[PDB]
From a paper:
Re-annotation of the activity of an earlier enzyme in the pathway, MenD, then led to the recognition that the true enzymatic activity of MenH is to covert the MenD reaction product, 2-succinyl-5-enolpyruvyl-6-hydroxy-3-cyclohexene-1-carboxylate (SEPHCHC) to 2-succinyl-6-hydroxy-2,4-cyclohexadiene-1-carboxylate (SHCHC) by a 2,5 elimination of pyruvate from the cyclohexene ring. MenH is thus correctly annotated as SHCHC synthase. As is characteristic of the α/β-hydrolases the three catalytic triad residues (Ser86, His232, Asp210) are located on loops of the core α/β–domain.
Accordingly, we report the structure of the MenH from E. coli at 2.75 Å resolution, along with the structures of two active site mutant enzymes, Arg124Ala and Tyr85Phe, both at 2.5 Å resolution. Each of the structures contains three independent molecules (A, B and C) in the asymmetric unit but EcMenH appears to be monomeric in solution on the basis of size exclusion chromatography and dynamic light scattering (results not shown). In the case of EcMenH the helical lid sits over the loops containing the active site catalytic triad residues and form part of the active site cavity. A notable feature of the active site cavity is the presence of two anions that are consistently found bound in all EcMenH structures, occupying the same sites in each. The chloride ion makes one charge interaction, with NH2 of Arg168, and additional interactions at distances of 2.9–3.4 Å from the OH groups of Tyr85 and Tyr148 and the side chain ND2 of Asn233. The structure also contains candidates, the main chain NH groups from Leu87 and Phe23, for the classical oxyanion hole of the α/β hydrolases. In most chains of the native and mutant EcMenH structures there is a conserved water molecule located within a suitable distance and orientation to form hydrogen bonds with the NH groups forming this “traditional oxyanion hole”. For the native structure, for example, TS docking with no distance constraints resulted in all solutions being “succinyl-in” for chains A and C, together with the top 3 solutions for chain B. In each case the top solutions agreed to within an rms deviation of 1.5 Å.
Residue numbers in the entry: 0 to 252
Write the structure that this text describes.
Amino acid sequence: SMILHAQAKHGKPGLPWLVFLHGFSGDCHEWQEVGEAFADYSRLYVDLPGHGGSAAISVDGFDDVTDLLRKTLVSYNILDFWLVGYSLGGRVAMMAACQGLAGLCGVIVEGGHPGLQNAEQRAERQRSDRQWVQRFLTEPLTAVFADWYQQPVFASLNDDQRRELVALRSNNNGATLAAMLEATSLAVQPDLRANLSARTFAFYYLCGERDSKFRALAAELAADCHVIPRAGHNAHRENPAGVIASLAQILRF
Ligand SMILES: [Cl-]
């Protein structure tokens, strides 16, 4: 059966694995600047459905994604690991941990939304996301991304940072990207605050000093929050030395 495309790097045999999950439009290169600091651990850089080398892999919902995740982990023979997810990757990570994974130590989430709290909020999100879908599904990505990185969550960016990101993300497939966006929209995602608060596994949170929206969301979660200095929503991209120190504080204790 099919499994997610991933890049594996081996570390010491007695340490767990660091399973890294990128955000929307990203690929398995997202966490590599950070991940490579943890030379003694094994690392698995995963490509989510519709991204990188997993572009052709199609999913309907989160269930399908977490089934691909369970199967990928089994193929790589990962029995002991941590799930590290950024934003979209952060949400598939929380979703996967709550459904249940064999040999999970803990989940580290960076700017991952734990879910909307009412049917009205979900209705707004579904409307706004369906707009984005058609935009990715038709229009040139190079133009769609220019608007994508102007959303309130990316406010803290300067135009120089924004130019680079639009250039990096434009190298993608809009149809597969749109199908993923649809399948895992925050509108369809349950409110996992209860399941996380149940404290079924170790759970940590990171977000940038400048990520006002997710700093706020963290206050609602039963988890430690590491606040990355001089960084925004994608804090590992702006301050990797900061994010390494935070992950090290957690993993090496
Ligand atoms: Cl990003």
